[PDB]
Amino acid sequence: AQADIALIGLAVMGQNLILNMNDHGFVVCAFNRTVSKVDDFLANEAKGTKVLGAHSLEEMVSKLKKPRRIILLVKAGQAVDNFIEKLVPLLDIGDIIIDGGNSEYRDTMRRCRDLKDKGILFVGSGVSGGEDGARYGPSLMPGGNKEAWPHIKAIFQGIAAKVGTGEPCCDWVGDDGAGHFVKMVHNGIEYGDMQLICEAYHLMKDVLGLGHKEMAKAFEEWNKTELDSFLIEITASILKFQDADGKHLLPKIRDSAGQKGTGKWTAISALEYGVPVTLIGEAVFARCLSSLKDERIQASKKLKGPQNIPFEGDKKSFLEDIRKALYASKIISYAQGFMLLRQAATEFGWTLNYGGIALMWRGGCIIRSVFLGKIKDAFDRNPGLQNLLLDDFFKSAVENCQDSWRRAISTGVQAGIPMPCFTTALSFYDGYRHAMLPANLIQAQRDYFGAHTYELLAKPGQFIHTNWTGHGG
Amino acid sequence: AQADIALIGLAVMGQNLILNMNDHGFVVCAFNRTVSKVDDFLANEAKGTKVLGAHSLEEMVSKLKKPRRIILLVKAGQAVDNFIEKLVPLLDIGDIIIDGGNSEYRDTMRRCRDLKDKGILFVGSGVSGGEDGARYGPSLMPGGNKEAWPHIKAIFQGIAAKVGTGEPCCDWVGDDGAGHFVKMVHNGIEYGDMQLICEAYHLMKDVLGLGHKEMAKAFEEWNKTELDSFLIEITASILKFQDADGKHLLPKIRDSAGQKGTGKWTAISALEYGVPVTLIGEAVFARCLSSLKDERIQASKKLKGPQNIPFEGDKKSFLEDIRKALYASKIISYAQGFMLLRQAATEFGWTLNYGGIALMWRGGCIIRSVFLGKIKDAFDRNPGLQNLLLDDFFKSAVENCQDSWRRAISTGVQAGIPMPCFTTALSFYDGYRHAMLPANLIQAQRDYFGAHTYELLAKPGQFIHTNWTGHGG
Ligand SMILES: NC(=O)C1=CN([C@@H]2O[C@H](COP(=O)(O)OP(=O)(O)OC[C@H]3O[C@@H](n4cnc5c(N)ncnc54)[C@H](OP(=O)(O)O)[C@@H]3O)[C@@H](O)[C@H]2O)C=CC1
Ligand SMILES: NC(=O)C1=CN([C@@H]2O[C@H](COP(=O)(O)OP(=O)(O)OC[C@H]3O[C@@H](n4cnc5c(N)ncnc54)[C@H](OP(=O)(O)O)[C@@H]3O)[C@@H](O)[C@H]2O)C=CC1
């Protein structure tokens, strides 16, 4: 009794969350497996604060006020499990472990269940924002065992980022893996937004022949419109940045996009649970494509492009078309993301508050934007909205953009600019608007070669198998 | 000693394979868990053949010539495992179990390994073709423990379908899950081909306003060109088919496409192992989209489409454009499929013979086509080809189609026809041809908000982190 909460894991993320925590008047006891790290932090970044250190897992446990509350901000995987094993013998029934690492929603569920019967309340939380966010106000997404929530509410919401009306970008997400499932869908969406920005970049660079200087200006103009977001803002900075030598740094960087795995999971989840989250799929795959750098070098030497027609038209107009095409496509993957969230909710029995989640992504996290605010009051006005595209704001915004959107894509297609995400968003949009789709032909084929049966348009329910093979032979 | 091989599982697929087997002069002993089924078959379909029945798993084992060879054509999952458990006590070291069900490549690997140390040779085989194929010549894809192969080679290749020069559409695929991994990639590709056919159907139906009668004729014309395939052929039949009442049956069928899961796995595998198999992804997702039937009904009432511009142009030309767009897109997903096959080969240590696999899909299976022949001699001429698009035939075929292809997609886009697969194939094509892609901007963003480091275009290898945040603050 003295420390309010413990944090294990002293890399920059843990470090900054403890300082953030301390600034809101919480005594935190630090610990790390390379114990020397605890000293180093106490004498350096945490010198002159109220944070205590522990040199043994056992004395860390000793410092805590009951219910003991300890946070793991350790590498996801095995590491988290090891710590749980060691922690459980020392803790009392009713104690709380939070895993803040980017964990697998399934590993979280398992752990949550497992700890319930040993009387230990487990919460898996998504943390977003990076070092900066960690330090002044991260976005936090806690889920797991709801009994832990009243014991941690004050800390998490206190250090959480705050939206303009002072609400925290943190609230209870739901049971077991919910917080960790929300965290990864956030990253899926993050991948999506980035690829969309790249596509817009690629069209103004190759079709419009803009230099990085003008392209930064155009993004900066765009950040004053509906597109106002952290990502459009940093993109304008990146395009302007000049290296030591005076020339722009971005053209020097190698185009193989890495990925630490979370985006991958969103798209795999959609595939497992049957949700058309096509834009995040294309975004993950566009990263896979860029990894085949040497292969694209070799392919560029021999695969021919379209005939070169120079762009004739008003650059200012096309620039505006690219803006609206980005915006409509962004609306589309957010509609795909929240329908994945709805399906997962249905699969695992979570009562998700989608306006709540919108608010949690409104600040702190990388995808923060004014856009998320508009999503929040769509679900406020109607919490049972099946799909974002049916809310009048989005239905109006997309309707309003579609001319430009189709123009932007036709030009790209003729010019040979790769647009994975612009094209899936439009395909999906046109797919979803259609009451009748050619899917009935798939059914006919499936029934024909594999006898799989089909149902009629009127009288859904009965499955028929036609004998196509011969009908008069 | 008397029967050459046993088959367990007497649904139509097992039934027909046993008759096929018997016709090639192999004595087969049948067995099934609802043992009554064995009698029913012996007195009915198998009456007057040489197939023996067994009424106990033990007497089935007794009838077999050593090395005992038994085939499971049972529902994939638990069922297969149950049978293995029961079989292993009765078998001798050196005996062979083949699982012909549509199994998980991972379950196959596990089983293959597991049985090795108990001295039982396991082979997992993919079987394709349906009832018809099962009866006269299926496509067969055996993998697992290579020691079983000489003992089953004669039967499998004997009942296998034969290509015009008499080679069997069956040869050893590789170790453990290989045969079962090839089987599922085949289905992935199958999903792909079907969605492409639907898209072509949708454009001639809505943009060209063709009736099902002309559309069948156009497909029938197309089946005489490079597009010559089983699927284009049955599609022409389906479009012509008239119901009892005299009107076309296809417009009566409900557009929710089912899926038994295999297509799903191909796309999940690509995501796990980092391969841009975008067309099969879009195809699986297009099935997911059609399942939201009631939702599309509700969306059709409120999401607006493009302005209605009537199609003005020559129908004959556009029809030809749709043909070439289908063909180029098909080339693209086959290039994506064989690069997935190459990566899996690299992941699990399989020495795959891609021309061999091309030959196995040349007859028997649903995707059979003249196209697969062209793929086979691409890999014959060069077995180490990294990607099909670099082979001069395909490089020429795509170059030759791209005008039409871009025309077809621009028209679709303006008209509002959903084209998931036509657009990913083009996106990917334009993606892969480009030596330099906007992926370097992702890297800049990743380094900026998450410190993730990046490497330079010249000097690959060194990872740099720039401090973007402030460069003079
Ligand atoms: N995508 C998004 O929206 C966002 C993602 N995130 C990510 O969350 C991540 C948090 O992890 P990070 O802090 O970088 O840590 P790392 O994954 O680098 O792991 C190092 C830390 O975990 C500990 N650790 C490592 N291995 C073990 C082990 N085997 N056993 C016990 N402890 C272990 C280390 O202790 P020791 O030093 O003793 O080894 C150290 O404290 C960040 O990378 C951040 O980018 C954050 C914000 C946003
Ligand atoms: N996509 C492609 O390219 C192709 C896919 N395939 C597919 O492969 C499939 C083969 O399976 P199919 O023959 O239809 O069989 P089913 O999946 O319908 O299973 C029924 C058969 O398996 C047995 N079985 C069921 N449950 C068990 C159990 N619990 N324990 C033991 N045995 C069990 C049944 O025996 P009992 O009657 O005693 O229950 C019966 O023999 C076909 O559906 C076919 O479409 C084939 C060609 C191509």
CSV table of N, CA, C and O in Angstrom, one decimal, chain A residues 194 198 235 250-258 274-275 282 285 288 293 295-296 300 302 304-306 390 402 406 410 413 416 423-424 427 429 432-440 443 445 455-457, chain B residues 194 198 235 250-258 274-275 282 285 288 293 295-296 300 302 304-306 390 402 406 413-414 416 423-424 427 429 432-440 443 445 455-457:
chain,number,residue,atom,x,y,z
A,194,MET,N,-4.1,5.2,-45.0
A,194,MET,CA,-2.8,5.4,-45.5
A,194,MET,C,-2.8,5.1,-47.0
A,194,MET,O,-2.3,5.9,-47.8
A,198,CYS,N,-2.0,7.5,-50.2
A,198,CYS,CA,-1.0,7.2,-51.3
A,198,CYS,C,-1.5,7.3,-52.6
A,198,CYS,O,-0.8,7.8,-53.5
A,235,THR,N,1.0,14.0,-43.6
A,235,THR,CA,1.4,13.8,-45.0
A,235,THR,C,1.8,15.2,-45.6
A,235,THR,O,2.9,15.2,-46.3
A,250,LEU,N,11.3,12.5,-49.2
A,250,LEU,CA,10.3,11.4,-49.6
A,250,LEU,C,10.8,10.6,-50.8
A,250,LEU,O,10.9,9.4,-50.7
A,251,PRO,N,11.1,11.3,-52.0
A,251,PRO,CA,11.6,10.5,-53.2
A,251,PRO,C,12.8,9.6,-53.0
A,251,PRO,O,13.1,8.8,-53.8
A,252,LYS,N,13.6,9.8,-51.9
A,252,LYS,CA,14.7,8.9,-51.5
A,252,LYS,C,14.3,7.6,-50.9
A,252,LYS,O,15.2,6.7,-50.8
A,253,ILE,N,13.2,7.5,-50.3
A,253,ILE,CA,12.8,6.4,-49.5
A,253,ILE,C,12.3,5.2,-50.4
A,253,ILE,O,11.6,5.3,-51.3
A,254,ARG,N,12.8,4.0,-49.9
A,254,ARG,CA,12.4,2.8,-50.6
A,254,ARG,C,11.0,2.4,-50.3
A,254,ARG,O,10.5,2.4,-49.2
A,255,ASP,N,10.3,2.1,-51.4
A,255,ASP,CA,8.9,1.7,-51.4
A,255,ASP,C,8.5,0.3,-51.1
A,255,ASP,O,7.8,-0.3,-51.8
A,256,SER,N,9.0,-0.3,-50.0
A,256,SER,CA,8.6,-1.6,-49.5
A,256,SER,C,7.9,-1.2,-48.1
A,256,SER,O,8.7,-0.7,-47.2
A,257,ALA,N,6.6,-1.4,-48.0
A,257,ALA,CA,6.0,-1.0,-46.8
A,257,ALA,C,6.0,-2.1,-45.8
A,257,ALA,O,5.6,-3.2,-46.2
A,258,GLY,N,6.5,-2.0,-44.6
A,258,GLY,CA,6.5,-3.0,-43.7
A,258,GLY,C,5.1,-3.1,-43.0
A,258,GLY,O,4.2,-2.4,-43.3
A,274,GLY,N,-17.2,-13.7,-42.7
A,274,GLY,CA,-18.0,-13.3,-43.8
A,274,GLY,C,-18.4,-11.9,-44.0
A,274,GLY,O,-19.5,-11.6,-44.5
A,275,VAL,N,-17.5,-10.9,-43.8
A,275,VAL,CA,-17.8,-9.5,-43.9
A,275,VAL,C,-17.0,-8.9,-45.0
A,275,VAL,O,-15.8,-9.1,-45.0
A,282,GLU,N,-7.5,-4.9,-49.6
A,282,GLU,CA,-6.6,-4.3,-50.6
A,282,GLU,C,-5.5,-3.5,-50.0
A,282,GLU,O,-4.4,-3.6,-50.6
A,285,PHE,N,-2.8,-6.1,-48.8
A,285,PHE,CA,-2.2,-6.6,-50.1
A,285,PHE,C,-1.4,-5.6,-50.8
A,285,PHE,O,-0.4,-6.0,-51.4
A,288,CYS,N,1.9,-5.9,-49.3
A,288,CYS,CA,2.5,-7.2,-49.8
A,288,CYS,C,3.1,-7.0,-51.2
A,288,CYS,O,4.3,-7.4,-51.4
A,293,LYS,N,9.7,-5.6,-54.5
A,293,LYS,CA,10.4,-4.5,-55.1
A,293,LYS,C,11.2,-5.0,-56.3
A,293,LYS,O,11.0,-4.5,-57.4
A,295,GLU,N,11.1,-7.7,-58.0
A,295,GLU,CA,10.2,-8.2,-58.9
A,295,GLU,C,9.5,-7.1,-59.8
A,295,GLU,O,9.4,-7.3,-61.0
A,296,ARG,N,9.1,-6.0,-59.1
A,296,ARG,CA,8.5,-4.9,-59.9
A,296,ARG,C,9.5,-4.2,-60.8
A,296,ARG,O,9.1,-3.9,-61.9
A,300,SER,N,8.8,-4.0,-64.6
A,300,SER,CA,8.8,-2.7,-65.3
A,300,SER,C,9.6,-2.6,-66.6
A,300,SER,O,9.2,-1.9,-67.6
A,302,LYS,N,9.5,-5.1,-68.7
A,302,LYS,CA,8.8,-5.8,-69.7
A,302,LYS,C,7.2,-5.7,-69.8
A,302,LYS,O,6.7,-6.0,-70.9
A,304,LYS,N,4.0,-3.7,-70.5
A,304,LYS,CA,3.7,-2.4,-71.1
A,304,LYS,C,2.4,-1.8,-70.4
A,304,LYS,O,1.5,-2.5,-69.9
A,305,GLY,N,2.4,-0.5,-70.4
A,305,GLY,CA,1.4,0.3,-69.9
A,305,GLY,C,0.4,0.7,-71.0
A,305,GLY,O,0.6,0.3,-72.1
A,306,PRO,N,-0.6,1.6,-70.6
A,306,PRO,CA,-1.5,2.2,-71.7
A,306,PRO,C,-0.7,3.1,-72.6
A,306,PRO,O,0.5,3.5,-72.3
A,390,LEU,N,-26.3,4.3,-44.7
A,390,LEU,CA,-27.8,4.6,-44.6
A,390,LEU,C,-28.0,5.9,-43.8
A,390,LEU,O,-29.2,6.3,-43.7
A,402,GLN,N,-19.9,11.3,-55.9
A,402,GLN,CA,-19.7,10.3,-56.9
A,402,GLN,C,-19.4,10.6,-58.3
A,402,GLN,O,-18.7,9.7,-58.9
A,406,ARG,N,-16.0,8.9,-59.8
A,406,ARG,CA,-16.0,8.1,-61.1
A,406,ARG,C,-15.0,8.7,-62.1
A,406,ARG,O,-14.4,7.9,-62.8
A,410,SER,N,-11.8,6.7,-63.6
A,410,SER,CA,-11.6,6.5,-65.0
A,410,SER,C,-10.3,7.1,-65.6
A,410,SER,O,-9.6,6.5,-66.4
A,413,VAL,N,-7.4,4.8,-64.4
A,413,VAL,CA,-7.5,3.6,-65.2
A,413,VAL,C,-6.9,3.8,-66.6
A,413,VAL,O,-6.2,3.0,-67.1
A,416,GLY,N,-3.1,4.5,-66.2
A,416,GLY,CA,-2.3,3.4,-65.7
A,416,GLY,C,-1.8,3.5,-64.2
A,416,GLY,O,-0.8,2.9,-63.8
A,423,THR,N,-10.7,1.7,-56.2
A,423,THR,CA,-11.6,0.8,-57.0
A,423,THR,C,-12.4,-0.1,-56.2
A,423,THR,O,-13.6,-0.3,-56.5
A,424,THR,N,-11.9,-0.7,-55.1
A,424,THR,CA,-12.7,-1.6,-54.3
A,424,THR,C,-13.8,-0.7,-53.6
A,424,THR,O,-14.9,-1.2,-53.7
A,427,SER,N,-16.4,-0.3,-56.2
A,427,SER,CA,-17.0,-1.6,-56.5
A,427,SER,C,-18.0,-2.0,-55.5
A,427,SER,O,-19.2,-2.4,-55.8
A,429,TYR,N,-19.4,0.0,-53.2
A,429,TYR,CA,-20.5,0.9,-53.2
A,429,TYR,C,-21.5,0.5,-54.3
A,429,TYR,O,-22.7,0.3,-53.9
A,432,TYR,N,-23.3,-2.8,-53.2
A,432,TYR,CA,-24.2,-2.7,-52.0
A,432,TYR,C,-25.5,-2.0,-52.5
A,432,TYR,O,-26.5,-2.4,-52.0
A,433,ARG,N,-25.4,-0.9,-53.3
A,433,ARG,CA,-26.6,-0.3,-53.8
A,433,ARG,C,-27.5,-1.2,-54.6
A,433,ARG,O,-28.6,-0.8,-54.9
A,434,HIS,N,-27.0,-2.3,-55.2
A,434,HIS,CA,-27.8,-3.1,-56.1
A,434,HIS,C,-28.6,-4.1,-55.3
A,434,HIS,O,-28.1,-5.0,-54.6
A,435,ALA,N,-29.9,-4.0,-55.6
A,435,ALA,CA,-30.9,-4.9,-55.0
A,435,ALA,C,-30.7,-6.3,-55.6
A,435,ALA,O,-30.8,-7.3,-54.8
A,436,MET,N,-30.4,-6.4,-56.9
A,436,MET,CA,-30.2,-7.7,-57.6
A,436,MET,C,-28.8,-7.6,-58.2
A,436,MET,O,-28.4,-6.7,-58.9
A,437,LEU,N,-28.0,-8.7,-57.8
A,437,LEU,CA,-26.6,-8.8,-58.2
A,437,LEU,C,-26.4,-10.1,-59.0
A,437,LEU,O,-27.2,-11.0,-58.9
A,438,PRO,N,-25.4,-10.3,-59.9
A,438,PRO,CA,-25.2,-11.5,-60.7
A,438,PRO,C,-24.8,-12.8,-59.9
A,438,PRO,O,-24.5,-13.8,-60.5
A,439,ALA,N,-24.9,-12.7,-58.6
A,439,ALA,CA,-24.6,-13.8,-57.7
A,439,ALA,C,-25.5,-15.0,-57.9
A,439,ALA,O,-25.1,-16.1,-57.7
A,440,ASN,N,-26.7,-14.7,-58.4
A,440,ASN,CA,-27.6,-15.8,-58.8
A,440,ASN,C,-26.9,-16.7,-59.9
A,440,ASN,O,-27.1,-17.9,-59.8
A,443,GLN,N,-24.7,-19.2,-58.2
A,443,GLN,CA,-25.6,-20.3,-57.7
A,443,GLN,C,-26.0,-21.3,-58.7
A,443,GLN,O,-26.0,-22.5,-58.4
A,445,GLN,N,-24.2,-22.0,-61.4
A,445,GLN,CA,-23.0,-22.8,-61.7
A,445,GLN,C,-22.8,-23.8,-60.6
A,445,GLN,O,-22.5,-25.0,-60.9
A,455,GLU,N,-32.0,-21.2,-54.2
A,455,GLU,CA,-33.4,-20.9,-53.8
A,455,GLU,C,-33.9,-19.9,-54.7
A,455,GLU,O,-33.1,-19.2,-55.4
A,456,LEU,N,-35.2,-19.8,-54.9
A,456,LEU,CA,-35.8,-18.8,-55.7
A,456,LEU,C,-36.0,-17.5,-55.0
A,456,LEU,O,-36.0,-17.4,-53.8
A,457,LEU,N,-36.1,-16.4,-55.9
A,457,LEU,CA,-36.2,-15.1,-55.5
A,457,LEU,C,-37.5,-14.8,-54.7
A,457,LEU,O,-37.4,-14.1,-53.7
B,194,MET,N,-15.4,-17.7,-61.6
B,194,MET,CA,-16.9,-17.5,-61.6
B,194,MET,C,-17.3,-16.0,-61.4
B,194,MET,O,-18.1,-15.5,-62.1
B,198,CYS,N,-19.4,-13.6,-63.9
B,198,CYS,CA,-20.6,-12.8,-63.5
B,198,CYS,C,-20.4,-11.4,-63.9
B,198,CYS,O,-21.4,-10.8,-64.3
B,235,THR,N,-21.9,-21.9,-68.4
B,235,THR,CA,-22.6,-20.6,-68.4
B,235,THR,C,-23.5,-20.3,-69.6
B,235,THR,O,-24.6,-19.9,-69.4
B,250,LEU,N,-32.7,-18.6,-64.9
B,250,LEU,CA,-31.6,-17.8,-64.2
B,250,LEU,C,-32.2,-16.6,-63.5
B,250,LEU,O,-32.0,-16.5,-62.3
B,251,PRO,N,-33.0,-15.6,-64.2
B,251,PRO,CA,-33.6,-14.5,-63.5
B,251,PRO,C,-34.5,-14.8,-62.3
B,251,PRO,O,-34.8,-13.9,-61.5
B,252,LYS,N,-34.9,-16.0,-62.1
B,252,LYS,CA,-35.7,-16.5,-60.9
B,252,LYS,C,-34.9,-16.8,-59.7
B,252,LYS,O,-35.4,-16.9,-58.6
B,253,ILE,N,-33.6,-17.0,-59.9
B,253,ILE,CA,-32.7,-17.4,-58.7
B,253,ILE,C,-32.3,-16.3,-57.8
B,253,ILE,O,-31.9,-15.2,-58.3
B,254,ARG,N,-32.3,-16.6,-56.6
B,254,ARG,CA,-31.9,-15.7,-55.5
B,254,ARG,C,-30.4,-15.5,-55.5
B,254,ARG,O,-29.6,-16.5,-55.5
B,255,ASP,N,-30.0,-14.3,-55.6
B,255,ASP,CA,-28.6,-13.9,-55.6
B,255,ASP,C,-27.8,-13.8,-54.3
B,255,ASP,O,-27.2,-12.8,-54.0
B,256,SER,N,-27.9,-14.9,-53.5
B,256,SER,CA,-27.0,-15.0,-52.3
B,256,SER,C,-26.1,-16.2,-52.6
B,256,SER,O,-26.7,-17.3,-52.8
B,257,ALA,N,-24.8,-16.0,-52.8
B,257,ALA,CA,-24.0,-17.1,-53.2
B,257,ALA,C,-23.5,-17.8,-52.0
B,257,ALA,O,-23.0,-17.1,-51.1
B,258,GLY,N,-23.7,-19.1,-51.9
B,258,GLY,CA,-23.1,-19.8,-50.7
B,258,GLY,C,-21.7,-20.1,-50.9
B,258,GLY,O,-21.1,-19.7,-51.9
B,274,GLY,N,1.7,-13.3,-46.8
B,274,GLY,CA,2.1,-12.0,-47.5
B,274,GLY,C,2.1,-12.0,-49.1
B,274,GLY,O,2.9,-11.4,-49.7
B,275,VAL,N,1.1,-12.7,-49.7
B,275,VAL,CA,1.0,-12.8,-51.2
B,275,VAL,C,-0.2,-12.0,-51.6
B,275,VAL,O,-1.3,-12.3,-51.1
B,282,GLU,N,-11.3,-10.6,-53.5
B,282,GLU,CA,-12.5,-9.9,-54.0
B,282,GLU,C,-13.6,-10.9,-54.3
B,282,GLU,O,-14.8,-10.6,-54.0
B,285,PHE,N,-15.2,-12.1,-51.0
B,285,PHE,CA,-15.9,-11.0,-50.5
B,285,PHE,C,-17.1,-10.7,-51.3
B,285,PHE,O,-18.1,-10.3,-50.8
B,288,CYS,N,-19.7,-12.8,-49.9
B,288,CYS,CA,-20.1,-12.2,-48.7
B,288,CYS,C,-21.1,-11.1,-48.8
B,288,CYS,O,-22.1,-11.1,-48.1
B,293,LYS,N,-28.5,-9.7,-48.8
B,293,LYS,CA,-29.6,-9.5,-49.7
B,293,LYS,C,-30.5,-8.4,-49.2
B,293,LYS,O,-30.8,-7.4,-49.9
B,295,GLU,N,-30.2,-6.3,-46.9
B,295,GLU,CA,-29.5,-5.0,-46.7
B,295,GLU,C,-29.4,-4.3,-48.1
B,295,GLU,O,-29.6,-3.1,-48.1
B,296,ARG,N,-29.1,-5.0,-49.2
B,296,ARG,CA,-28.9,-4.4,-50.5
B,296,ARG,C,-30.3,-3.9,-51.0
B,296,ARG,O,-30.4,-2.8,-51.6
B,300,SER,N,-30.8,-0.1,-51.9
B,300,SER,CA,-31.2,0.3,-53.2
B,300,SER,C,-32.3,1.4,-53.2
B,300,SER,O,-32.4,2.2,-54.1
B,302,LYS,N,-32.2,3.8,-51.1
B,302,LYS,CA,-31.7,5.1,-50.8
B,302,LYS,C,-30.3,5.5,-51.3
B,302,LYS,O,-30.1,6.7,-51.3
B,304,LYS,N,-27.9,6.5,-54.2
B,304,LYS,CA,-28.0,6.9,-55.6
B,304,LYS,C,-26.9,6.4,-56.4
B,304,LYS,O,-25.7,6.3,-55.9
B,305,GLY,N,-27.2,6.2,-57.6
B,305,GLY,CA,-26.2,5.8,-58.6
B,305,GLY,C,-25.7,6.9,-59.5
B,305,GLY,O,-26.1,8.1,-59.2
B,306,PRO,N,-24.9,6.7,-60.5
B,306,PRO,CA,-24.5,7.7,-61.4
B,306,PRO,C,-25.7,8.2,-62.2
B,306,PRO,O,-26.8,7.7,-62.2
B,390,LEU,N,5.6,-12.7,-66.7
B,390,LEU,CA,6.9,-12.5,-67.4
B,390,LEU,C,7.0,-13.5,-68.6
B,390,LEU,O,8.1,-13.4,-69.3
B,402,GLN,N,-5.1,-4.9,-73.1
B,402,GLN,CA,-5.2,-3.8,-72.2
B,402,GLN,C,-6.0,-2.5,-72.6
B,402,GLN,O,-6.7,-1.9,-71.7
B,406,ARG,N,-9.2,-1.5,-70.3
B,406,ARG,CA,-9.4,-0.2,-69.6
B,406,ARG,C,-10.7,0.5,-70.1
B,406,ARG,O,-11.3,1.2,-69.3
B,413,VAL,N,-17.5,1.6,-64.6
B,413,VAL,CA,-17.4,2.7,-63.6
B,413,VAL,C,-18.4,3.8,-63.8
B,413,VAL,O,-19.0,4.3,-62.9
B,414,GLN,N,-18.5,4.3,-65.1
B,414,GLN,CA,-19.4,5.4,-65.4
B,414,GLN,C,-20.9,4.9,-65.3
B,414,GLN,O,-21.8,5.7,-64.9
B,416,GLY,N,-22.0,2.5,-63.4
B,416,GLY,CA,-22.3,2.0,-62.0
B,416,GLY,C,-22.4,0.4,-61.9
B,416,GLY,O,-23.1,-0.1,-61.0
B,423,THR,N,-11.6,-4.8,-61.5
B,423,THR,CA,-10.8,-3.7,-61.0
B,423,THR,C,-9.5,-4.1,-60.2
B,423,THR,O,-8.5,-3.5,-60.4
B,424,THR,N,-9.6,-5.1,-59.4
B,424,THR,CA,-8.4,-5.6,-58.7
B,424,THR,C,-7.4,-6.1,-59.7
B,424,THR,O,-6.2,-5.7,-59.5
B,427,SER,N,-5.7,-3.1,-61.1
B,427,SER,CA,-5.0,-2.4,-60.1
B,427,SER,C,-3.6,-3.1,-59.8
B,427,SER,O,-2.6,-2.4,-59.9
B,429,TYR,N,-2.2,-5.3,-61.8
B,429,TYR,CA,-1.4,-5.2,-63.0
B,429,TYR,C,-0.6,-3.9,-63.0
B,429,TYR,O,0.6,-3.9,-63.1
B,432,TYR,N,2.1,-3.9,-60.2
B,432,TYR,CA,3.2,-4.8,-60.4
B,432,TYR,C,4.1,-4.3,-61.5
B,432,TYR,O,5.3,-4.3,-61.3
B,433,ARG,N,3.6,-3.7,-62.6
B,433,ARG,CA,4.4,-3.1,-63.6
B,433,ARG,C,5.2,-1.9,-63.1
B,433,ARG,O,6.2,-1.5,-63.8
B,434,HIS,N,4.9,-1.3,-61.9
B,434,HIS,CA,5.6,-0.1,-61.6
B,434,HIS,C,6.8,-0.4,-60.7
B,434,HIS,O,6.7,-1.0,-59.7
B,435,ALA,N,7.9,0.1,-61.2
B,435,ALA,CA,9.2,-0.1,-60.5
B,435,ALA,C,9.2,0.7,-59.2
B,435,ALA,O,9.7,0.3,-58.1
B,436,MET,N,8.5,1.9,-59.2
B,436,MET,CA,8.4,2.8,-58.0
B,436,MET,C,7.0,3.0,-57.7
B,436,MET,O,6.2,3.4,-58.6
B,437,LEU,N,6.6,2.7,-56.5
B,437,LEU,CA,5.2,2.8,-56.0
B,437,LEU,C,5.1,3.8,-54.8
B,437,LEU,O,6.1,4.0,-54.1
B,438,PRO,N,3.9,4.4,-54.5
B,438,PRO,CA,3.8,5.3,-53.4
B,438,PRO,C,4.0,4.8,-52.0
B,438,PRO,O,3.8,5.5,-51.0
B,439,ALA,N,4.4,3.5,-51.9
B,439,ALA,CA,4.6,2.8,-50.7
B,439,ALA,C,5.6,3.5,-49.8
B,439,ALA,O,5.6,3.4,-48.6
B,440,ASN,N,6.6,4.2,-50.5
B,440,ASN,CA,7.6,4.9,-49.7
B,440,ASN,C,6.9,6.0,-48.8
B,440,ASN,O,7.3,6.2,-47.7
B,443,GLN,N,5.8,4.4,-45.6
B,443,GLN,CA,7.0,4.2,-44.8
B,443,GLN,C,7.4,5.5,-44.0
B,443,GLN,O,7.7,5.4,-42.8
B,445,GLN,N,5.1,7.8,-43.2
B,445,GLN,CA,4.1,8.0,-42.2
B,445,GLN,C,4.4,7.1,-41.0
B,445,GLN,O,4.4,7.5,-39.8
B,455,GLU,N,14.2,2.6,-45.1
B,455,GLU,CA,15.5,2.5,-45.7
B,455,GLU,C,15.5,3.3,-47.0
B,455,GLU,O,14.4,3.6,-47.6
B,456,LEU,N,16.7,3.7,-47.5
B,456,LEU,CA,16.8,4.4,-48.7
B,456,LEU,C,16.9,3.6,-49.9
B,456,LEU,O,17.2,2.4,-49.9
B,457,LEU,N,16.4,4.2,-51.0
B,457,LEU,CA,16.3,3.6,-52.3
B,457,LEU,C,17.7,3.0,-52.8
B,457,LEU,O,17.8,1.9,-53.4
